[PDB]
Amino acid sequence: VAAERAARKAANKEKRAIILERNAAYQKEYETAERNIIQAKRDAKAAGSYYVEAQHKLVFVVRIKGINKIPPKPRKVLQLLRLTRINSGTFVKVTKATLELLKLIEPYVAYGYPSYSTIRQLVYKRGFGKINKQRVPLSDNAIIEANLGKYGILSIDDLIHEIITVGPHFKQANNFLWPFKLSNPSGGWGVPRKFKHFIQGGSFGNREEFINKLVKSMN
C-alpha cells in the first residue's frame, strides 16, 4: 500500500499550496488596509479636514472578577458570552445588540479593540476548537478544515482572518473557538485596585487599544 501514502502525500501537498496562496493574499490585504488608513489620515490633514476612523467592529472581552456575589442579570450575560471563569476571554462582534450586553457586565470585565498581533498570538498559543462537545487543541490545519471547511476556512490563518475582519461566518468561526483560558497578567495589572473603571484608575470597562498590552501579558 504505497499508492495510499502517495495519494495522501499528493493531496496534502496540494492543500498546503492553497494555504500558502491564501496566507500570502491575506498578508497583502492587511498591509494595504493598514497603509490606506494612514494615507487617509494624512490626506485629510492636508485638505484641512479630519478623517474619522471607522468605529471598531470587534472587541476582545476578559472576565476580571471571580464567580461569587454576581447579581442575576450580569451573571446571565456573562454566561451568554461564555465567560464562566476568571481570566477567560472571547471575541465579540460589535453591534447595538452586543454593546448593550457589555454595558450590563462592565464592572466584571476588561475589554477593548484587539490588534492582529494579539489575535494571532491568542489562537496560536491558546486556540482550542469545540469538536463534538470537547475542547481539542488546534494543533493541525486538518482539525480546522474538518469542522469549519463548510464555511471556507481551511487553516489557522483563515480562522484568524475571519475573526479580525468580522467576516460573514464570524459567528460560526468564533463559536468554534473554545473560550480562551488566560493566566493572570505576568507583570500584574498596573493598578493597586482592579474593581473600578479604567478611567478612574482601575481595570474594568472599555480600555480601547490598551486591551492589547493586557492580553499579551495574560497570554
Partner: peptide, 21 residues
C-alpha cells in the same frame, strides 16, 4: 501541545507562509 510561537517546526506545520514571511 507545542506552541507555534516557540517551536519553529510547529510554526511551519501550521503556516507554510512563515517561511516566505
Amino acid at each position: 501541545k507545542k506552541n507555534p510561537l516557540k517551536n519553529k517546526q510547529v510554526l511551519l506545520r501550521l503556516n507554510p507562509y512563515a517561511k516566505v514571511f
